[PDB]
Amino acid sequence: EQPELEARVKEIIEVDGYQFRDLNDNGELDPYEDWRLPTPERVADLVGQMSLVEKSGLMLINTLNAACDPQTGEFGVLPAQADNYINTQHMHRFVFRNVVDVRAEGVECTGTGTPVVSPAEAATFTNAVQEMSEATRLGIPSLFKSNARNHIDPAGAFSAFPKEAGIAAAALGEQARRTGEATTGDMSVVADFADVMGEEWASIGLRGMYGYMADLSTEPRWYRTHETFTEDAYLAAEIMETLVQTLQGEELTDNGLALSPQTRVALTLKHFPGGGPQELGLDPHYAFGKAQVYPAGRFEEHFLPFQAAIDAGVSSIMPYYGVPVDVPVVGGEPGETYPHTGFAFSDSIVNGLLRDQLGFTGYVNSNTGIINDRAWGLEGNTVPERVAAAINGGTDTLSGFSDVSVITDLYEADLISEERIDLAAERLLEPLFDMGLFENPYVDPDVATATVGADDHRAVGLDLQRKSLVLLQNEETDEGPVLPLKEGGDVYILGDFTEETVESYGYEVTNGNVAEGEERPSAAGSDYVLISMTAKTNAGDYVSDDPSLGLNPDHGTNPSVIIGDDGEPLPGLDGQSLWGAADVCVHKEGHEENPSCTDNRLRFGGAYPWESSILDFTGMEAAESWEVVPSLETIQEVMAEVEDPSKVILHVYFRQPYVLDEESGLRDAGAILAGFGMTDTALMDVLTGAYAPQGKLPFALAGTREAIIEQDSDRPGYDETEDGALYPFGYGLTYED
Numbered sequence: 001e002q003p004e005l006e007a008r009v010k011e012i013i014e015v016d017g018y019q020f021r022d023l024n025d026n027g028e029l030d031p032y033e034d035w036r037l038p039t040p041e042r043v044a045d046l047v048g049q050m051s052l053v054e055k056s057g058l059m060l061i062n063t064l065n066a067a068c069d070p071q072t073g074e075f076g077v078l079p080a081q082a083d084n085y086i087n088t089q090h091m092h093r094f095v096f097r098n099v100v101d102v103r104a105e106g107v108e109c110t111g112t113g114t115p116v117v118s119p120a121e122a123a124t125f126t127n128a129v130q131e132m133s134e135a136t137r138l139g140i141p142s143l144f145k146s147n148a149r150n151h152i153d154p155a156g157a158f159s160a161f162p163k164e165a166g167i168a169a170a171a172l173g174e175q176a177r178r179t180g181e182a183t184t185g186d187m188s189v190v191a192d193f194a195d196v197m198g199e200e201w202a203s204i205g206l207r208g209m210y211g212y213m214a215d216l217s218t219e220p221r222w223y224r225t226h227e228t229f230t231e232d233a234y235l236a237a238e239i240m241e242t243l244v245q246t247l248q249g250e251e252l253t254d255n256g257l258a259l260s261p262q263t264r265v266a267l268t269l270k271h272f273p274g275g276g277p278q279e280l281g282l283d284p285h286y287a288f289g290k291a292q293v294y295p296a297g298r299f300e301e302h303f304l305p306f307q308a309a310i311d312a313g314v315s316s317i318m319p320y321y322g323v324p325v326d327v328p329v330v331g332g333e334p335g336e337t338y339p340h341t342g343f344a345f346s347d348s349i350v351n352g353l354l355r356d357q358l359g360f361t362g363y364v365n366s367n368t369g370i371i372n373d374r375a376w377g378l379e380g381n382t383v384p385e386r387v388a389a390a391i392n393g394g395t396d397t398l399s400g401f402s403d404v405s406v407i408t409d410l411y412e413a414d415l416i417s418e419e420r421i422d423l424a425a426e427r428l429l430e431p432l433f434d435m436g437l438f439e440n441p442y443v444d445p446d447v448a449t450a451t452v453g454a455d456d457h458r459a460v461g462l463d464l465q466r467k468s469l470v471l472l473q474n475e476e477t478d479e480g481p482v483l484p485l486k487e488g489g490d491v492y493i494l495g496d497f498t499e500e501t502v503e504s505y506g507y508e509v510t511n512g513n514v515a516e517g518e519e520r521p522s523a524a525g526s527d528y529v530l531i532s533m534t535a536k537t538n539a540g541d542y543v544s545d546d547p548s549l550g551l552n553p554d555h556g557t558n559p560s561v562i563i564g565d566d567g568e569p570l571p572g573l574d575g576q577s578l579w580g581a582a583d584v585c586v587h588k589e590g591h592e593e594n595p596s597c598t599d600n601r602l603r604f605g606g607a608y609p610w611e612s613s614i615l616d617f618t619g620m621e622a623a624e625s626w627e628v629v630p631s632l633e634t635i636q637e638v639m640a641e642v643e644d645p646s647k648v649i650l651h652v653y654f655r656q657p658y659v660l661d662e663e664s665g666l667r668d669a670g671a672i673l674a675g676f677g678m679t680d681t682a683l684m685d686v687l688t689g690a691y692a693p694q695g696k697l698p699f700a701l702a703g704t705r706e707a708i709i710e711q712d713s714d715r716p717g718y719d720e721t722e723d724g725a726l727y728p729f730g731y732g733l734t735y736e737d
């Protein structure tokens with residue numbers, strides 16, 4: 001019966017033989033402080049007692065990073081904005097964005113450089129924030145959310161696993177290993193990762209996640225494929241179900257939400273109803289990228305993962321910024337289509353589809369920066385108009401919005417009903433009660449130290465690293481198959497490889513990695529060439545209103561067409577405009593003056609929009625916004641210096657479904673592997689034969705740029721193209737002895 005309580009500001013009070021927290025400091029026990037009652041009564045009693053300002057502060061979630069004290073050397077102190085956020089704007093939801101790791105030696109507190117904090121320091125911080133949260137009138141606790149933290153970047157003190165697609169690769173391979181085919185995967189893998197993730201996240205007081213992504217990799221040109229698990233909706237649905245089950249728990253509430261005091265991380269799945277199918281793979285962070293198009297009519301397939309997660313009881317949902325072009329309303333009259341606005345602002349999507357068609361009973365967390373920079377379809381509207389559109393659309397809380405007064409102003413102008421704010425407040429409080437945060441919101445900082453990156457947890461990560469590796473090609477020489485490596489030999493390395501780790505497996509290693517001026521050693525006479533390569537975008541120079549870039553007619557036009565519901569095409573998106581024209585800094589359609597460029601610098605990722613279909617390595621070499629690392633020119637020199645290319649072994653990281661074009665020569669390598677982020681002991685363990693490769697492609701790889709241009713952004717695979725797939729979904733070799 002009696003749950004554990006902790007209180008740093010308020011007092012505890014003995015009642016009816018049990019203990020309770022006196023969170024309103026009134027000396028008697030309110031129903032909302034009475035953990036014996038079911039959540040609906042505590043919420044109802046709590047909302048009853050809340051100011052108009054208290055209820056609307058819940059509808060904000062913003063960054064609240066740990067700071068350091070430059071005079072004391074202490075890390076994990078509140079920043080300056082904490083006071084204004086918790087006391088003035090009455091916020092209880094934050095995004096924690098610091099890296100968690102051991103700081104190198106000599107690293108002292110600077111100022112305002114979002115510091116790296118240790119596990120104990122991070123928990124110190126979130127405890128401090130809860131202490132200030134408890135200091136409010138009603139002592140409502142806070143929830144922190146964060147983007148993912150347990151994936152290698154080709155980190156911190158969080159246990160390192162491969163990237164999302166790498167986890168699916170491991171799950172497909174483990175199914176194949178034990179059954180024979182790779183369809184929906186073996187979720188024992190997924191559960192193991194999520195279990196390590198849960199304990200580590202909860203141990204530092206981080207109980208929410210902006211994620212995981214339920215999006216599908218159906219458009220290889222979408223830069224966000226790097227955070228996608230698969231292109232297969234049905235595999236996606238099983239991973240989502242498993243993530244929710246492991247991270248949130250399997251006890252649902254009467255309301256159908258997987259929420260309990262043992263819920264370690266409540267998920268806010270994203271990006272509803274599916275960020276994947278982007279026209280030309282252009283991303284709707286950017287004005288040119290507003291469109292989501294569905295040539296194969298797969299809109300329903302893309303939200304299957306969300307239905308799986310909703311049915312398992314996901315806590316929260318983030319709609320995307322995209323605009324669903326010409327998409328039949330689900331469960332609606334023939335001919336009816338969803339509004340040509342960003343999902344976050346379309347009531348038919350956040351209330352129609354999500355809640356009435358799909359049955360979701362939780363809250364809706366907007367994506368970040370919609371009201372000011374990305375209210376697609378509301379380019380003309382004002383900010384209060386945009387806020388009201390989202391809230392009345394069904395969004396309950398706004399990420400990156402920090403002026404509570406605007407919400408209150410809209411209520412006092414009857415632009416938002418009080419029932420609606422009450423309805424938000426209800427949905428936002430429900431998880432906090434169920435997750436036990438009204439009983440104890442604190443954590444032990446010593447225990448984060450023993451938890452984040454514990455040896456056993458990193459063991460699970462290394463296990464998944466080795467099972468994520470996909471072996472795509474393995475020439476059979478006259479001396480046998482290229483992989484596994486024979487013992488000993490001269491090995492040439494190119495690309496990010498730690499020489500000592502390769503060397504410790506018994507090879508004498510030449511390093512082809514040199515500074516830009518220095519003379520690269522030749523590769524001739526090597527027994528093995530280990531190349532580790534990838535492709536990266538370098539588009540920081542993009543500017544929407546530069547006649548050399550965004551408004552350069554020599555860069556083509558934006559074939560994307562979104563006809564607004566005012567009967568008009570949206571600016572820059574009529575089908576014959578310059579790439580930079582969709583940006584507000586060109587069309588100016590805002591109620592503002594001399595507006596700034598949203599798209600400048602392409603800070604979030606992605607190539608120049610006119611280069612987004614260049615996924616073949618030879619093109620990427622020659623492109624302006626693409627860089628092959630290491631240079632394809634260096635690789636080709638190296639693959640020649642060894643006169644048999646069967647001695648070459650390519651570890652490729654497929655950040656996006658890159659295309660090994662036949663002209664590049666990379667298919668001449670003796671073995672090709674797809675890695676999804678792994679340490680070099682993991683990679684060398686597999687290469688030298690200590691473990692055999694078992695992962696399977698969680699997405700298909702094409703062998704022609706042409707197939708990239710023809711494929712259907714909403715459709716998996718390349719089976720509908722003239723050239724087809726180089727490697728299908730679910731492919732992967734092993735060794736056989």
Ligand SMILES: O=C(O)[C@H]1O[C@@H](Oc2ccc([N+](=O)[O-])cc2)[C@H](O)[C@@H](O)[C@@H]1O
Nearest residue numbers: 095147210211270367368399603604605
């Ligand atoms: O963290 C946030 O507040 C949210 O930011 C939003 O925009 C970004 C997208 C990509 C990157 N990036 O790749 O750098 C940075 C920001 C995302 O749509 C959302 O998924 C995320 O949860």
Ligand SMILES: [Zn+2]
Nearest residue numbers: 015016017029
């Ligand atoms: Zn009583």
Ligand SMILES: [Zn+2]
Nearest residue numbers: 022028029030
């Ligand atoms: Zn009380």
Ligand SMILES: [Zn+2]
Nearest residue numbers: 054090136140
């Ligand atoms: Zn409050």
Ligand SMILES: [Zn+2]
Nearest residue numbers: 237238241308
């Ligand atoms: Zn199922």
Ligand SMILES: [Zn+2]
Nearest residue numbers: 279282289291
């Ligand atoms: Zn787009």
Ligand SMILES: [Zn+2]
Nearest residue numbers: 411412413414
């Ligand atoms: Zn009134």
Ligand SMILES: [Zn+2]
Nearest residue numbers: 199451454456
């Ligand atoms: Zn443990």
Ligand SMILES: [Zn+2]
Nearest residue numbers: 503507508509
């Ligand atoms: Zn030696």
Ligand SMILES: [Zn+2]
Nearest residue numbers: 553554555556
């Ligand atoms: Zn020209």
Ligand SMILES: [Zn+2]
Nearest residue numbers: 548549555624
């Ligand atoms: Zn150019």
Ligand SMILES: [Zn+2]
Nearest residue numbers: 218711712715
């Ligand atoms: Zn496709």
Ligand SMILES: [Zn+2]
Nearest residue numbers: 704706722723
């Ligand atoms: Zn052809």
